[PDB]
Amino acid sequence: MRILVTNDDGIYSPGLWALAEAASQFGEVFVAAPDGHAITIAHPVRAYPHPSPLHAPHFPAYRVRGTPADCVALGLHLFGPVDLVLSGVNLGSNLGHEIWHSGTVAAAKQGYLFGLSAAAFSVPLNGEVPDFAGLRPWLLRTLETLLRLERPFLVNVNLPLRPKGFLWTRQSVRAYEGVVIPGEDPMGRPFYWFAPRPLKEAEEGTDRWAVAQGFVSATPLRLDLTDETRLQPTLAH
Amino acid sequence: MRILVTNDDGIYSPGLWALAEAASQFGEVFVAAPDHAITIAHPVRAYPHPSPPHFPAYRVRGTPADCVALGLHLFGPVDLVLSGVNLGSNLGHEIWHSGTVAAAKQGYLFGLSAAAFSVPLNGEVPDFAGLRPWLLRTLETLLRLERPFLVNVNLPLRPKGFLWTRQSVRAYEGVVIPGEDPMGRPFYWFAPRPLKEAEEGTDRWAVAQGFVSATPLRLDLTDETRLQPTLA
Amino acid sequence: MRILVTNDDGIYSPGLWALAEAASQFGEVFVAAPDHAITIAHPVRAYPHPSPLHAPHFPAYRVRGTPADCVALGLHLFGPVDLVLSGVNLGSNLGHEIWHSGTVAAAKQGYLFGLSAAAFSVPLNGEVPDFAGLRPWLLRTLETLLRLERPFLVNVNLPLRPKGFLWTRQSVRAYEGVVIPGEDPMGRPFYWFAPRPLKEAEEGTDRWAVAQGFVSATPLRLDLTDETRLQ
Amino acid sequence: MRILVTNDDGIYSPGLWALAEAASQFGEVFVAAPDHAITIAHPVRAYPHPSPLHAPHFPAYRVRGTPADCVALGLHLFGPVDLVLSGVNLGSNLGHEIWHSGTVAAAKQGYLFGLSAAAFSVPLNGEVPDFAGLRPWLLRTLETLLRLERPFLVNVNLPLRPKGFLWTRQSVRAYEGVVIPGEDPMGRPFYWFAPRPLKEAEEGTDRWAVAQGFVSATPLRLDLTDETRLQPTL
């Protein structure tokens, strides 16, 4: 079991090393983390060997001057063959509508596009970093569960600061109300505050609802964005 | 009908005005385009901008999603959000990281109908005058759909037809080619390639055949075949 | 003495905490590092941050802004501050590099506010700094700076394994433009830029000193005016 | 004389073409403008850029890099070059702003390569600059610059409607910190920074000069060493 660990926050993020350490209990771990979200193809990318931190076990590692997906492409090359791609633990949530724009998810998705199993890991912050020592038991429990899954898999994981359980969830998909509030800076110049708000509370069974309940959320994701119910649409006239 | 037109290439792209003009044949058009989620951490600046026909327009120092939120405030009420015409394809796996699509998706999240428009490139620059008839046809077709809708459109340089399509979803094999710059420093080229030919009925397949591709999109990324009960 | 410590690499950089710890040996340290001018346009966010596990406790904030922003915000949240220390940066800040250095800009901003300040950097050249080994030298350097008349503005570059300390002047070499063409996968062209210095660094300059293995300390001016060209 | 003209605002700035046209009265002009340090991480892309129907033609490239990259590439594609002109920037570059100016960085890069160079900027103050009105002043300034001993490095700020020309020194004022808290409509806290200078700009400085209506030209030094402190009293 060879595991490539990457993230979106960069090579110095405490979240990256917490995931690398948790993952090492399940196989050999290699790290490639960044110094857009797609693989850079128009030109060469720089990547250099990087010494893992003093207060973490040792892990072979590279700092990549590219995107999280670039880290996956490079990692599969330098440390091949790789069986699993783990991305995170991101300092900040990746829930509901957020999954679309997540670099952390983008790395995991890239691993899956290459035919490997993958999972993204994130922790909701709201002004307060996480305690990775306390989350460790939960990181391990989550990884254990993921490894029993039929492969390949693609899962998006969100762990609350202090977990009280685990739940497989679906993505929260809420409609939003547009809220724009005009304002002016200290210089009298105008600007606009954007504060779009969801129309309802997160529904039970969703990732958003689960973390709010103190549960680790695991959402299996698909790659296909096709709305399969509208391929032969009824047209008015 | 009131239509907000935006894009990802910015206020100076000819594709934007081509889209704005085509849309004007179906309703009142307003433009808000960048100078991918909605900016909330800080406020956004936006300025009136002249169109190169005339359209009320703003240049926004934010993301395409920002342009949609701002356009709604500046030009509300709005019924339809159109994004593009992007110079470059937004096919298959590209849909995920597309700013053009992100704007259309934002409009849909606000309860409106939306569509993204892109034209695959390389070597040849789009002739929007030639594309106009196909743009109008596509728009006319989209406006016959049950609402609301969210569709991703890719038009080839010179279309010969229109097809509804599903997104191309292919596996890739990694390709990494180590190298050195003229100063002997190391670097890596990435050239991952698709494992097979695009499937029939997919967006990538359709454009390759010279047809306009229109893929309806789903917001929910949940894979229900892998949902699970609790073990309590 | 109250000391504000910041940097350009961010709140998670090991060089940041190495500087804070070394500084704590001379006064009470407060930290504000980014998550180069002061952001006057829009509002900036800042959050209380916990000091690293294996490091002394330091009141600290993670700032969603520039190094100069950290200085401005820091003087507000921890005022009064006597000294601003920026670094230790991972990468050199020698000669022509000083002008556009973010680490240096934080220090300059402190000076602009009427305080003493110093920037600390360690040229890497492919390796990584060992802050445990550099501590004695960081301390010796701080000790020497605190003997200066206040306020002062000094740029410090510490080689990985220092064998001495020297006051230096900034190296100012002329460069030669080296451009080598190449092509992307579509055969489209691009160019590699590799400008190179024309001569060796002059003795006594910051570049020269680090190449000798010495810690370089360059006092900086704020005035870019070339007085010899006025009149 | 061959002249490389670049800027920080980009290939479509009217300020760029005004400078290029003024420079053409003095020698052959070539343009390389962005699409502050030289990029060495990856290679930089550049593409031939066309001249408009109603404009004199200048060989030019749009460069996907920094203003400094434009200078290096420009020296390669159009070399040999004798002078590097950067601007005209839409917005001032006075006093403390000089350190963060991309317009100035390009001129400085030219100087680092052994050439003469000058940066040009116009403070906006809520107006759109009139380059037909500024042209005479651009020409007078170039005339002054071109008789200087070479190489030179000068930072020029032209007021919207100049009435004179002054050699100035950079304004260097101390500041007082001003931080004013606030919170977004969602109740989240944030901070506004509004540091302010302790005094009015001194006579003879670039800021004073422009406030008075004069074109300001400041010769710049590369050496940031404060030599009055090379052997301090500890």
From Swiss-Prot, chain A:
Nucleotidase that shows phosphatase activity on nucleoside 5'-monophosphates. Its cofactor is a divalent metal cation. Signal peptide: none annotated. It is an enzyme of class 3 (hydrolase). It is found in: Cytoplasm. A divalent metal cation binds at D8, D9, N90. Belongs to the SurE nucleotidase family. This is 5'-nucleotidase SurE. Binds 1 divalent metal cation per subunit. Its EC number is 3.1.3.5. PANTHER family: 5'-NUCLEOTIDASE SURE, 5'_3'-NUCLEOTIDASE SURE. Its main location: cytoplasm. GO terms for cellular component: cytoplasm. InterPro entries: SurE, SurE-like_Pase/nucleotidase, SurE-like_sf. Keywords: Cytoplasm, Hydrolase, Metal-binding, Nucleotide-binding, Plasmid. It catalyses: a ribonucleoside 5'-phosphate + H2O = a ribonucleoside + phosphate. It comes from the Bacteria. One of its GO terms (molecular function) is metal ion binding.
UniProtKB/Swiss-Prot annotation, chain B:
The keyword Nucleotide-binding applies. It catalyses: a ribonucleoside 5'-phosphate + H2O = a ribonucleoside + phosphate. Binds 1 divalent metal cation per subunit. It is found in: Cytoplasm. One of its GO terms (cellular component) is cytoplasm. It is an enzyme of class 3 (hydrolase). GO terms for molecular function: 3'-nucleotidase activity; 5'-nucleotidase activity; exopolyphosphatase activity; metal ion binding; nucleotide binding. Its EC number is 3.1.3.5. Its cofactor is a divalent metal cation. A divalent metal cation binds at D8, D9, N86. Its main location: cytoplasm. Keywords: Cytoplasm, Hydrolase, Metal-binding, Nucleotide-binding, Plasmid. Nucleotidase that shows phosphatase activity on nucleoside 5'-monophosphates. Belongs to the SurE nucleotidase family. This is 5'-nucleotidase SurE. It comes from Thermus thermophilus (strain ATCC 27634 / DSM 579 / HB8). The lineage of its organism: Bacteria, Thermotogati, Deinococcota, Deinococci, Thermales.
